[PDB]
Design a protein around this nucleic acid. Sequence first.
RNA 1: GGUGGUGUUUACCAGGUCAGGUCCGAAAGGAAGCAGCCAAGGCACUGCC
Length: 69
Amino acid sequence: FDLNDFLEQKVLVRMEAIINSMTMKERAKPEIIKGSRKRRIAAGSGMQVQDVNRLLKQFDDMQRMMKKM
RNA sequence: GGUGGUGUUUACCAGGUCAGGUCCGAAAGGAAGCAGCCAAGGCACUGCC
């Protein structure tokens, strides 16, 4: 379950904008989205790092389950 | 090296365009711009000079 699937799932429209700002490598192996990338991803999706961190946290939640069922 | 070709590679770090999103604006409309793409660079093979 990579960020590519979690994408299929201005309310959420912005939660998309964020991913539509990532790169294939990022959307495929999130454990590489440190500071620098974030600062890119945020300003890229007109958001803010905190926003990204939010979505990042969301993915994890929606992720762990897959790895537990 | 120059200038071509082909394969490969490259998140941001004053190239271009810009979905999506953001920004300013009562509006009309402006602005910056991620991914993508183009271009460009790198690693090689290669033609020519």
